Amino acid sequence: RPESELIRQSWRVVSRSPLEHGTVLFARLFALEPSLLPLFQYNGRQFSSPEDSLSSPEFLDHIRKVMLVIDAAVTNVEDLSSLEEYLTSLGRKHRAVGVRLSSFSTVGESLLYMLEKSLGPDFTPATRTAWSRLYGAVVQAMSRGWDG
Ligand code: HEM
Numbered sequence: 001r002p003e004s005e006l007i008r009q010s011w012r013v014v015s016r017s018p019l020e021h022g023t024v025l026f027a028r029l030f031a032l033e034p035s036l037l038p039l040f041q042y043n044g045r046q047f048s049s050p051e052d053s054l055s056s057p058e059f060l061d062h063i064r065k066v067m068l069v070i071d072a073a074v075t076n077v078e079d080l081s082s083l084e085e086y087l088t089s090l091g092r093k094h095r096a097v098g099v100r101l102s103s104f105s106t107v108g109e110s111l112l113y114m115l116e117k118s119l120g121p122d123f124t125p126a127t128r129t130a131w132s133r134l135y136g137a138v139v140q141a142m143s144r145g146w147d148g
């Protein structure tokens with residue numbers, strides 16, 4: 001398709017520095033939905049503030065994990081059924097830790113935000129539409145993990 005190369009092309013520069021870029025996504029995510037912060041409980045303890053999360057190795061390791069799942073979705077953009085299985089399980093786990101399926105709309109806007117900010121003029125409405133569709137495919141697959 002042409003959408004696939006829009007995604008592949010947009011992801012290139014972001015994918016080279018995954019923690020720097022994922023740190024934008026999370027900072028935006030906590031700015032939109034502060035109530036996500038307490039859901040990371042490493043040694044059953046809660047982050048008081050967003051800048052607290054950024055000092056946590058485990059938290060930063062979760063940013064890399066997110067970005068690796070996105071790298072998988074970009075990799076397999078033309079055949080996503082393969083990931084469907086993993087993604088339902090991923091969804092299950094995120095129900096187990098306290099994530100409300102509604103919070104993933106905030107995730108999508110954070111991912112668009114981060115991409116818009118690294119691409120500037122290159123993130124065209126077509127690029128936005130391409131990502132919104134891929135992210136949608138991801139979220140359908142993970143939401144099976146709440147039930148469906
Ligand atoms: C509101 C958004 C999210 C919250 C609060 C959240 C929270 C968590 C928590 C608490 C864990 C277990 C602790 C840890 O491994 O670091 C986890 C694991 C994970 N998260 Fe997230 N998460 C969210 C979104 C995402 C998204 C969007 C992705 C991927 C696209 C993702 C990928 C993962 C992965 C890969 C793991 C490892 C699970 C496993 O295989 O054990 N997370 N997340």
Ligand SMILES: [Ar]
Binds near residue numbers: 021022023026
């Ligand atoms: Ar991320």
Ligand SMILES: [Ar]
Binds near residue numbers: 023026030050051053
């Ligand atoms: Ar953050």
Ligand SMILES: [Ar]
Binds near residue numbers: 064065066068069
């Ligand atoms: Ar991962």
Ligand SMILES: [Ar]
Binds near residue numbers: 068069072
């Ligand atoms: Ar993955």
Ligand SMILES: [Ar]
Binds near residue numbers: 069073135138
């Ligand atoms: Ar994703």
Ligand SMILES: [Ar]
Binds near residue numbers: 093094095097
């Ligand atoms: Ar999880």
Ligand SMILES: [Ar]
Binds near residue numbers: 029066107
């Ligand atoms: Ar996320």
Ligand SMILES: [Ar]
Binds near residue numbers: 107108
């Ligand atoms: Ar994401």
Ligand SMILES: [Ar]
Binds near residue numbers: 133
């Ligand atoms: Ar998205």
Ligand SMILES: [Ar]
Binds near residue numbers: 070073134135138
């Ligand atoms: Ar995605």
Ligand SMILES: [Ar]
Binds near residue numbers: 073080
């Ligand atoms: Ar997917």
Ligand SMILES: [Ar]
Binds near residue numbers: 104107139
């Ligand atoms: Ar997602």
Ligand SMILES: [Cl-]
Binds near residue numbers: 012
């Ligand atoms: Cl490259």
